[PDB]
Design a protein around this motif. Structure first.
Motif, short mmCIF file in Angstrom:
data_model
loop_
_atom_site.label_atom_id
_atom_site.label_comp_id
_atom_site.label_asym_id
_atom_site.label_seq_id
_atom_site.Cartn_x
_atom_site.Cartn_y
_atom_site.Cartn_z
N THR A 50 0.80 -1.07 -0.01
CA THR A 50 0.18 -0.01 0.16
C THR A 50 0.93 1.31 0.07
O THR A 50 0.14 2.50 0.12
CB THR A 50 -1.10 -0.05 1.04
N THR A 51 2.22 1.31 -0.05
CA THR A 51 3.14 2.82 -0.08
C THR A 51 4.69 2.61 -0.33
O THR A 51 4.90 2.68 -1.42
CB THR A 51 2.72 3.84 1.07
N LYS A 52 5.34 2.78 0.71
CA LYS A 52 6.75 3.00 0.42
C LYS A 52 7.83 2.21 0.48
O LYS A 52 9.19 2.60 0.48
CB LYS A 52 7.26 4.05 1.76
N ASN A 104 22.56 -4.29 43.84
CA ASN A 104 23.18 -3.38 42.84
C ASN A 104 23.96 -2.21 43.74
O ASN A 104 24.94 -1.84 43.47
CB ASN A 104 22.32 -2.74 41.94
#
Lengths: 318, 239, 183
Positions: free
Chosen positions: B77-79, B198
């Motif tokens: 549908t595009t890029k 820690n």
């Protein structure tokens, strides 16, 4: 010798915005009357209202046109926490039809379609400090998928896509930060799409923009090896951003940047509210509390100057 | 060659060799007949997507062969997007379509993913966090993701306080009396232990202090809501 | 890595071997791993950037790649080198006997491995040195040619080069080694 000709809009409530289509043949207006109107330019250079509809029950903050390759598509965003996508369904039976409502927690402060080469994508920003990027998977069926959430850690007031189609630049978004933040500076942040992580990562923070940011605009790159960014705050600022150097052996980072303030203008005389480039990125318009629109242009020595100022009665200042 | 070896095959050697070389359709079919519930196909496709996202040129050239051996129901549908996006789309499809009552699902996927490095591609996450609003917190504190674990917990508490409950499959906040509220106490105690192991780490201590303050706000509001529920349940033994 | 290295190299030197050939087999097996780790490694600027992971309340420098480590140890005279240089010397001495001892081949392979290691080393050397200078890491590295120049401590003379050479005498017998040497 610019000439301005009044038209009787006869709006129910004052329209807080006007947007031209990409071709400058159509315009959309929006108002406190809860409506959007669309106007078409006749051959005789007269404007005619071709559509008028009630759109929302909230302060429409922004309106934007898609690229014409995706058809006649509008997006709007609102204080109601939503963005909406609209398609001009014409038969002479135009009636801008709501295709979707994006509903993903606070006022949606700005909305911008992405550059067309990235597909039919829509960015929204909200006062929750999130930018959301949606993609329409089918341009013929204006369904939208949430692709990205970008946590800015500051209230977002405005967004700008970098319009560069160069494959040498990852997709980039500039974001602002309205928060008055007596202390926190960095109210403009730049995000770059990282192909390796498939996520937007924070590439830059313009630490010199300790003032609240009202608007931002990337200039059209037009073959420059550096980007230009305008920023509206208490003053108009213009930045040049030069991407640093590189080695083809390996790469996975945001490629750090060299940023220079090339102009700062306090001549607005009020909190500059808007900045807009002309289509060539050679003239800047600004507006402020002084009730004026000012025009700025560089000469051939890169010296920027003002080139026009206006009045409440509508006359250009002599 | 395996032509000859198919001359004496079996109901699962086949499944495996074929899930091997792409063919992610022919095999979903062989399986659904001989009913044998298939998580090897999804794990192998996830492995190919990961290798492509970290793949070299040669890997992109070879990928067009197995991509073409499927449609991709409907393409585009595009890029455009260099595969990449290609296999992740065959995903959304071979998932939502071929899906099961139990879990050939979110779990097997999230796992092969944290297993080989990945800020989880946001689609999967969003969809395993209102259908199964926790157990992942566990997948997280196991795959050493302490930072992101504390994040999920905070998000869930936020939901529980009536804020964003729709993004956590939660029905109620301070309303319709009191019903059920699962508190992930064991995961919070593991977070408290991991933050305490820690020590020097200033960032982990800043996060731990923020989390503790938020938990105290929650327990104070929970105490109030429980005391108000006790008052509500005491009205009426006067019918 | 640590394991491998330490254990096997130490041994390779001193630890009884009922079978005299086994001694060289162990050396070959370890050096094969070292070689693959250094050859497979490629470094791009992130390597010389280092991080400290908090384990059980103590900050420990984490684990740079296999080969960042492999290579730091080669640009200084850590025994590896010595040992590599000693292995080469031993190889040439044994080969100069022309006698048919068992393990002669294995040795060939191992020495080949060694020389190849050496070769790649110089290129990647220029590279790392360069980067290293850019990263402001307090790590002092020496050029491979300078290491070759330096007199062996046991020998107490600059026989390092001398020996290499001598491998050219075996050019008919072992051409591969010969090529690498000349190179």
């Amino acid at each position: 010798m610019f000439v301005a000709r009044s038209i009787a809009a006869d709006h129910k409530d004052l329209i807080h915005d006007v947007s031209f289509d990409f071709h400058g043949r159509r315009m959309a207006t929006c108002s406190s009357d809860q409506s959007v109107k669309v106007w078409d330019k006749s051959e005789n250079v007269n404007w005619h209202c071709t559509a008028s509809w009630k759109t929302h029950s909230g302060s429409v903050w922004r309106v934007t046109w898609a690229h014409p390759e995706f058809g006649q598509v509008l997006a709007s965003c609102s204080f109601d926490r939503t963005a909406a996508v609209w398609e001009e369904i014409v038969g002479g039976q135009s009636h801008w039809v709501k295709r979707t409502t994006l509903v993903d927690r606070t006022s949606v402060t700005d909305v911008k379609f992405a550059p067309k080469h990235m597909g039919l994508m829509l960015a929204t920003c909200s006062a929750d400090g999130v930018v959301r990027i949606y993609e329409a998977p089918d341009v013929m069926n204006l369904q939208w998928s949430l692709q990205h959430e970008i946590s800015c850690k500051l209230s977002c007031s405005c967004i700008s896509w970098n319009p560069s189609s160069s494959r040498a630049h990852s997709p980039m978004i500039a974001v602002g930060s309205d928060d008055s933040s007596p202390n926190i500076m960095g109210k403009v942040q730049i995000y770059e799409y990282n192909e390796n992580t498939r996520k937007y990562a924070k590439a830059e923070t313009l630490m010199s923009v300790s003032d609240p940011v009202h608007d931002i605009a990337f200039a059209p790159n037009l073959g420059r090896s550096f980007h230009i960014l305008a920023v509206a705050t208490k003053d108009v600022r213009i930045f040049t951003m030069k991407p640093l150097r590189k080695e083809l052996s390996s790469s996975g980072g945001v490629t750090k940047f060299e940023n220079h303030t090339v102009a700062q203008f306090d001549n607005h005389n009020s909190q500059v509210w808007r900045v807009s480039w002309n289509i060539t990125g050679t003239v800047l318009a600004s507006s402020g509390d002084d009730g004026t629109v000012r025009l700025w242009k560089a000469n051939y020595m890169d010296n920027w100057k003002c080139i026009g100022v206006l009045k409440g009665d509508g006359n250009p200042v002599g | 060659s395996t032509a000859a070896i198919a001359g004496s095959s079996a109901a699962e050697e086949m499944v495996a060799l074929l899930v091997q070389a792409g063919l992610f359709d022919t095999a979903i079919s062989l399986c659904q007949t001989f009913k044998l519930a298939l998580t090897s196909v999804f794990e192998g496709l996830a492995c190919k997507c990961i290798r492509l996202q970290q793949g070299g040129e040669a890997a992109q050239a070879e990928a067009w062969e197995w991509l073409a051996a499927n449609q991709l129901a409907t393409v585009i549908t595009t890029k455009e997007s260099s595969a990449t996006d290609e296999a992740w789309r065959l995903m959304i499809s071979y998932l939502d379509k071929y899906e099961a009552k139990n879990t050939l699902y979110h779990h097997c996927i999230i796992n092969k993913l944290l297993s080989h490095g990945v800020p989880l591609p946001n689609w999967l996450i969003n969809r395993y966090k209102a259908m199964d609003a926790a157990e992942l917190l566990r997948l997280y504190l196991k795959y050493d993701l302490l930072e992101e674990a504390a994040e999920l917990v905070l998000e869930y508490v936020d939901a529980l306080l009536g804020k964003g409950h729709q993004y956590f499959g939660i029905q109620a906040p301070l309303s319709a009396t009191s019903q059920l509220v699962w508190f992930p106490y064991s995961a919070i105690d593991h977070l408290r232990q991991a933050l305490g192991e820690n020590e020097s780490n200033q960032h982990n201590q800043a996060i731990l202090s923020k989390l503790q303050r938020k938990m105290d706000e929650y327990f104070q509001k929970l105490k109030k809501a429980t005391d108000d529920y006790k008052k509500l349940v005491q009205k009426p033994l006067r019918a | 890595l640590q394991f491998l290295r330490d254990t096997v190299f130490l041994r390779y030197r001193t630890r009884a071997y009922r079978r005299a050939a086994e001694k060289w087999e162990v050396a070959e097996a370890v050096l094969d791993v070292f070689y693959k780790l250094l050859k497979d490694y490629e470094p791009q600027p992130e390597d010389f950037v280092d991080q400290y992971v908090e384990l059980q309340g103590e900050e420990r420098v984490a684990f740079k790649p296999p080969g960042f480590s492999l290579m730091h140890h080669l640009l200084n005279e850590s025994p590896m080198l010595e040992l590599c240089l000693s292995l080469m010397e031993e190889g040439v001495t044994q080969l100069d006997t022309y006698a048919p001892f068992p393990g002669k081949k294995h040795l060939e392979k191992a020495v080949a491995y060694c020389f190849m290691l050496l070769n790649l080393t110089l290129q990647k050397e220029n590279r790392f040195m360069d980067l290293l200078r850019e990263s402001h890491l307090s790590m002092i590295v020496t050029p491979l040619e300078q290491l070759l120049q330096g007199i062996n401590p046991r020998s107490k003379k600059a026989d390092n080069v001398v020996n290499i050479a001598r491998y050219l005498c075996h050019g008919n017998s072992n051409a591969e080694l010969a090529f690498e040497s000349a190179k």
